[PDB]
């Protein structure tokens, strides 16, 4: 049973790390809340979505200083995952929370991904078709609506050519990256997009760590 | 010539297993039939696809007792493959045959897959666009039609947001799994859906084995 | 230094090969021209795309004899890449240039791929939606238009059910293959299509090498 040392170690480490991370997540104080982002995004859920982006970033920097990236560190990064393709503008990210502006300028759709995070999306423009698991019918959501993709849930997502939304996620953020880059690794092979994603996540993490040091 | 032992061994094993499986397929008595399933689905291709599903499952359990899964073992499982995403309800499966209810509640499309099985789909609702290999034109099929994906053939499939059909496949069913789970491994990473697929296939195989023991 | 022998060798080989390939591309005469292919395709972008294909192939074989594959070596091969699925008819290909007739008979879309080649597409029929990186809006191109996918650029492409175009690429063609087969390896697993792609590329390379031997 000597070679079972590695297997027992892996099982015990997974159990211990799950216990630690889950207790942390359920006892951790959080910066943002889904209702906050939802109200902020629904206030600006209009036709013009670029002005909505600007106003939302301004409000977030006003009510949460030191937690939103500066304009210098902002860039739209492609996101290929689950068979769909969109783009993201990451405003805030940590090990447990993230806030971004997501959306697509083309018709896409695929698997939503099943990860260890709860994600709220408030549509600013476009249409969002969601197909829940185990059903045979889907629902369409319009600007102003907010869809909550809960932890462990898997749905089919679909977006029209002009869809843009504000997204807030809470959970274990690194695990979500494993999904968010899968198609980038095995389908698109856009290594520059992989670098951009890692770079923006690292910049957000460094901002969050720098704010903690001053406090 | 020890380094060449592995290559000769695998080639010989592949040839022997291919001949054995093909002789089995040419000698095996079959439970279902393509024309039978097509006729059964065509009987109700005028109804709501859920009513059609109910009546088809009832008729299958009547005409083939001991070969269709119990309602307790029935569940809709997502299916991501070839760039498309749908869902399945597996009613019967063996090493050589399978019967299921397939379809999507979103607009999808992709590669049909090229495997060692013949697959018949009878559309109950929606639209089914098929693009055969080597051509520059596609064809759309409507409720009541039956599409035959032959062995070794590869086409492009596309389905609208409300498409549902009855599907019967015959051949070497395990050979298909490599395709039916590929996107689940490298794109969606939905290992829970992979577990569900393995679970329903194992339940169908165990049902088929249990029916053989009583006879 | 022993653990670094492989790493030092790989670094030196990559540097030497990059310099060699760049000096070759800078010191190589080219067979085709981007404006030439664009003009030839736009002159016939008013006909049925099959008649356009025929006339374009005739003109290419007239103005460039010995560089376009014979009709016996021409076949439509499926192309699954970046999440989209179309088909190609390769007319000319070398290590530095390629000319083909691309398009899809289904509605598809995905990642354009980011490789080391500049690619011009002249739409003969259908519609072509392109979404550039860093932007929030896409543009639609119609028959007669020419899209230039530059080196290092990454976009989102989308095509309607009847889209067909003439495509000319120049750069390091092998670098593109890594993209053009990703979905074929990890999603569709249509290894017969992979064989067809390798076969047509090898036929084009052998034709181009045979033309050099006579000269
Ligand atoms: C995200 C793309 C949305 C496209 C909107 C198409 C107009 C409505 O489409 C309908 O939506 C229903 C539920 O979603 C589907 O079940 C129906 O099949 C479909 O006709
Ligand atoms: C390639 C498939 C083209 C389908 C055309 C659908 C009708 C056009 O649709 C419009 O096209 C614009 C251009 O990107 C988008 O910005 C808009 O969001 C979209 O509504
Ligand atoms: C699967 C959903 C299909 C949507 C129906 C679109 C209306 C018909 O669309 C037509 O069908 C033809 C055959 O497929 C295509 O070749 C044409 O390009 C397309 O215009
Ligand atoms: Au941005
Ligand atoms: Au932004
Ligand atoms: Au079911
Ligand atoms: Au069912
Ligand atoms: Au051809
Ligand atoms: Au052709």
Numbering used by the authors:
A (entry chain A), B (entry chain E), C (entry chain C): 3 to 217
From the paper:
The sigma-1 receptor (σ1R) is a non-opioid transmembrane receptor which has been implicated in many diseases, including neurodegenerative disorders and cancer. The sigma-1 receptor (σ1R) is a small, unique integral membrane receptor that is localized primarily in the endoplasmic reticulum (ER). σ1R responds to a structurally diverse array of synthetic ligands such as (+)-pentazocine (agonist) and haloperidol (antagonist). Published structures of human σ1R reveal its homotrimeric organization of a cupin-fold β-barrel body that contains the ligand binding site, a carboxy-terminal V-shaped two-helix bundle, and a single amino-terminal transmembrane helix, while simulation studies have suggested a ligand entry pathway that is generated by conformational rearrangements of the cupin-fold domain. Here, we present multiple crystal structures, including an open-like conformation, of σ1R from Xenopus laevis. Together with functional binding analysis our data suggest that access to the σ1R ligand binding site is likely achieved by protein conformational changes that involve the carboxy-terminal two-helix bundle, rather than structural changes in the cupin-fold domain.
In the end, we solved a structure for the wild-type σ1R from Xenopus laevis (xlσ1R), which shares 67% sequence identity and 89% sequence homology with human σ1R (hσ1R), to 3.20 Å, and termed it xlσ1Rclosed-endo. The xlσ1Rclosed-endo structure was solved in the space group P21 with each asymmetric unit containing 12 protomers, which deviate little from each other with all-atom RMSDs of only ~0.2 Å between the protomers. Superposition of individual protomers of xlσ1Rclosed-endo and hσ1RPD144418 excluding α1 yielded an all-Cα RMSD of 0.35 Å, indicating a high degree of structural conservation among σ1Rs from different species. However, xlσ1Rclosed-endo failed to achieve our initial goal as it was captured in a closed conformation similarly to hσ1RPD144418. Surprisingly, though no known ligand was added during purification or crystallization of xlσ1R, a clear electron density within the ligand-binding pocket indicates that xlσ1Rclosed-endo was bound by an unknown molecule, which may have an endogenous origin. Unfortunately, the current resolution of xlσ1Rclosed-endo (3.20 Å) provides only limited details about the shape of the electron density, making it impossible to reveal readily the molecular identity of this unknown molecule, and therefore the electron density was not modeled in xlσ1Rclosed-endo. In each asymmetric unit of xlσ1Rclosed-endo there are four homotrimers of xlσ1R, which are organized in a diamond shape with the cupin-fold domains packing against each other, whereas the transmembrane helices (α1s) mediate crystal contacts between adjacent asymmetric units. In such a packing mode, each trimer has one protomer whose cupin-fold domain is tightly buried by two adjacent cupin-fold domains.
